[PDB]
Symmetry: C4
Subunit: 329 residues, 4 copies
């Protein structure tokens, strides 16, 4: 909110495009928003709101909101403190923060910041490098492995090709000194850790069930922000069916286009356990570093609280039982 | 009609925004209109129109049209005679007028004007202050208590924050010299009055049924003009289901976006007993005081009469039995 | 086609608005088009087209196309020869022409032109004046009475009020030297004539059935070009249901927005026996008098023929058995 | 992609319009795109992509992609090498190329280029001329006869009439030195050749079944690029039903608006065996002759491969089992 404006007139055009971009025609980028805007909540009235709380328990810990910071690589591209700033603010808001495999600061350093860090894994050509990285994460106190499963390789970003965009020399992959994940990769991760494994990028109902059968503690119903298959269904379009198929067997998160506490409320009403928020957290980082993320998070927290109360929900659990109605435009 | 133009070039920008505004992205403001525009009426032909009447009986009294003036606070913000002017015109049109808790003239004075006044209650931190206010209303001859139940607190108006909008010093809360209502608040009102209690802001079908079981004489199916939860379903989208669930157990009114006699006809065909009209009555007040409201009301009366006759309805009851068809744009 | 342009830059603005206009917000004017554009035809292939014919039998006579000229009053408003010109061209195209009650040339004169004239009746305050007018029509060789039943009175034209539009002194109601029709009016017409009675302005399925039970030979499924109830469903939206309810019991025509032979084909595929065409015939009259109508009619005839052949229909009957599919925009 | 721009600023306006154009209002041209954009793919995750192949077997031969070049007449209109250039590139990409009846180079010469050529037949006034042409095709090594069945005659192109467009003198019908096909024409073709007969322009489910019963080896579900009946349903809207009715009885291809490998993936997910691509291949021919077509084909090949992998399909067969979801805009 208001932040995107402030980040546009400050980032190089090509960095902003790397941030804002989808794959191909960006059909799935836009559909993430369209899809949300079509969802109407049916609020409830006249319930006791004496103790409205936005807290949830997830993967063992309490979170202040039903939200985590989404994994986004190379946070130094947006601000010089990069991941550390986002991490500090997330910790101080009581929101999980997801450390990327391609973080521009090492994962041990990010985790040292404390709070409730998660680690996002990309499967690499070498199975041992992947599993090491999982072990580092866990040795460092990470609370979940978010296995990104919708990147057998990177989709085609048309902005980045026509930009000629490339990592400037002062941003690197601090965890280092590119292969398709299968269900066998998932099992290897699962066998190597006692942390919950959360599969990110699930859109098919049967992949959701199979995730549960494979021992995942969670999924993220996501089309990777419209960055992977162009024409992939939005996550929010599949969430409700996926929630009903998994039948409480794992946590179900959603992301893509979450831009307000109203949108969090919509996601929750469709049955999400929590949302991830990606580009907005980068807009706030770029606009004003740590303090800027802290304010995004405060604003989101007040919007969630407000939306929940107006919908007659004293708890996220109540918000999950709200009904919705699909509407026009 | 034509009036909004005339009110824009006369009100301060910030007052007009206080009037026109919704919550958040104004998703629900716009959806109130969108929703109405999608409804098509299926007219009937060749019936006897020898005695077309727009009258209805509601809460004991006869009303000239299936319409009442909606509660809108601080009517002095729009014209110096404020509530008194609107009240006089409503009385002379034979339309109920709803006195607000935050009226800029006292409720006893508004009621003295005569006609068929209703009183809109906000629940206040002190249960005794609320109930006093109910007793004043009734002692003053008000015919219904319209308990507004969709304001456990005020939604977030983005226009008003970015305006910095505030009550100028020459407009005040004349009934005085802010708490969430529950079903227990409703029962306390219901126990304290023999007037019909009308719950305003019901959108869930189960809240409608429960309203009836709680002894409400009416509900208003409403998303508070898009001013409360941003993303709340429009009232008009829920009306038909709500009418069928309550099964004649209480009157069912609707509001939000009613801009013509055709729209009243649409509302009635979806099963509403009557509509409320809010912003238009303020546009006409601001454009030309009492006389201006009188003309809005005459124009609406002729539009309802015209719409009804063209649809083959000699009575509002007939108009409620019309069928509708949802259409594109 | 192309003609509307040519009529705009030739008619007074107010005459063109009288022609182009709908009621209220013109919601139903526009919806007539929208509705047609959403209908897709499912063409058939590889059938024998050796003898493609656009002819139909209706109300006793053969017509060259499944089309008639719609009743439109005061044709002298558009061209000095007015009804006579349209009538001649219709006759020479083999298309029925509907003489209006408010024709700017007498009905006997219009009928003398020959061809297959129909007469459109408005019910007047005096039952005897209406029935006389029916008798004149029949004495004059008219082949059908098109009882317009959707004008208990004229809808509210906003263009005409804000224009101040009025009949110039050189155009009059040549049949003369305003009351609601009921089913009893229909029976009186039906008893007074051996001609088929065709009810025009039927939108409800039950009014269609009742028309058949009342002995109508036809109906016209029509919202009077969006000129009567603003918010009335389009005819084309109701046609298919109406066709199935009447079950061959009377002819079912449709009008509203028919602008091409493709649209005629769409109407026929939805089950219409024929269409009426209104504003386009006036555009062609105003653009170039009789010759101009003759060319509209030739162009329409070639479009129907073309559309039919491409859809694999050798006859209108075949075109009625085509399937359709509703689509987006 | 990017090519259309490059072809616009190089072709005469009237040639480009002959290329880009639909029939009538171009309702069906646009609906081909609209229809595709509404289809969302539901990708699968975590499958083995170790050997992703885009190959299919069709009509006896292996093709490199599930795609063929669509028949487009008078390719010399777009580039001086015309059909020979497109043919060479198609052959080198391993894509079938469809030789037109109205090719601007003879079919024997086009076929000599080698690769996997198909021949598109128009039925001519003389049954013997048609069958000769079939025999030439087969004598020349063509692998399929694509009988175009949606041109009993050419639809009405409004661009071409208002252009006055005509074949310049340096482009001719090199196969020569105009009649409606029936099922009897199909049987005569079928009896005269041992090649698979592929009916192109099937939109009705019953025509699809009957095609199979008539011994067709394939159909192309197509509205001829919006060039034949204006208002014809898009192919992509009918594909899924047609696939299920034919029940593997013949190959089912689709065309109309295929503009990317994502669109090929959408088509395949709806059950197509392969797509045809028309106007894009001409844009690339006009932009840069053979090399330009070679690059279109390489880009398409990488897009298909990318789309497939991101959707978790190692083979076209897998892509056919993907589910889809219809979405808004
Ligand atoms: C610039 C950038 C980079 C990545 C991602 C998103 C953006 C915007 N994303 C997608 C992100 O996690 C959310 O799915 C999406 O952004 C939510 O949508 P939203 O931004 O509208 O709130 C990533 N996902 C991974 O698993 N690993 C990564 O390195 C990551 O590829 N790189
Ligand atoms: C400026 C203003 C103030 C209020 C309201 C509406 C406007 C426009 N409203 C909503 C109103 O009653 C109708 O629900 C809505 O306006 C119909 O929609 P419409 O204006 O499109 O015809 C109120 N409702 C209450 O219960 N109490 C109030 O003090 C009130 O909050 N203040
Ligand atoms: C100017 C004018 C006047 C009339 C009508 C239409 C126009 C445009 N119409 C409606 C017409 O018959 C078709 O229903 C409609 O025009 C088809 O729609 P279309 O024009 O898009 O093709 C009439 N109907 C009657 O019964 N009697 C009349 O005097 C008439 O009121 N006057
Ligand atoms: C200029 C031109 C000429 C023809 C065709 C298409 C264009 C663009 N087409 C339609 C084409 O084969 C595809 O159906 C369509 O172009 C796919 O749509 P797409 O272009 O959006 O990819 C033909 N079809 C035939 O059978 N015979 C022909 O001579 C042909 O009439 N002439």
């Amino acid at each position: 909110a208001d932040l995107e404006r402030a980040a546009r007139d400050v980032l190089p055009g090509e960095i902003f495009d790397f941030l804002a971009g989808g794959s191909g025609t960006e059909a799935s980028l836009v559909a993430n928003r369209t899809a949300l805007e079509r969802v109407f909540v049916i609020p409830r009235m006249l319930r006791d709101l004496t103790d409205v709380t936005t807290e949830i328990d997830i993967f063992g810990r309490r979170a202040a909101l039903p939200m985590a910071v989404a994994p986004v690589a190379y946070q130094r591209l947006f601000h010089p403190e990069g991941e550390l700033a986002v991490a500090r603010a997330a910790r101080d808001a009581g929101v999980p923060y997801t450390i990327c495999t391609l973080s521009s600061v090492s994962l041990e350093e990010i985790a040292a910041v404390g709070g409730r860090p998660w680690f996002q894994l990309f499967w690499l050509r070498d199975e041992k490098r992947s599993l090491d990285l999982v072990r580092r994460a866990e040795d460092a106190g990470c609370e979940a492995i978010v296995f990104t499963v919708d990147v057998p390789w990177m989709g085609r970003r048309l902005r980045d090709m026509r930009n000629g965009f490339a990592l400037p020399e002062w941003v690197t992959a601090a965890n280092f000194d590119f292969a398709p994940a299968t269900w066998e990769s998932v099992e290897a991760v699962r066998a190597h850790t006692d942390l919950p494994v959360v599969l990110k990028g699930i859109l098919a109902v049967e992949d959701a069930r199979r995730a549960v059968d494979a021992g995942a503690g969670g999924i993220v119903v996501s089309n990777h922000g419209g960055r992977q298959l162009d024409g992939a269904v939005p996550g929010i379009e599949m969430l409700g069916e996926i929630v009903a198929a998994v039948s409480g067997g794992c946590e179900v998160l959603v992301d893509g286009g979450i831009r307000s506490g109203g949108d969090v409320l919509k996601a929750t009403a469709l049955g999400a356990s929590a949302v991830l928020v990606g580009r907005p957290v980068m807009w706030a980082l770029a606009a004003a570093g740590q303090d800027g993320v802290r304010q995004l998070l405060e604003l989101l927290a007040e919007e969630v609280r407000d939306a929940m109360g107006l919908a007659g929900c004293e708890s996220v659990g109540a918000a999950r039982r709200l009904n919705t109605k699909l509407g026009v435009v």
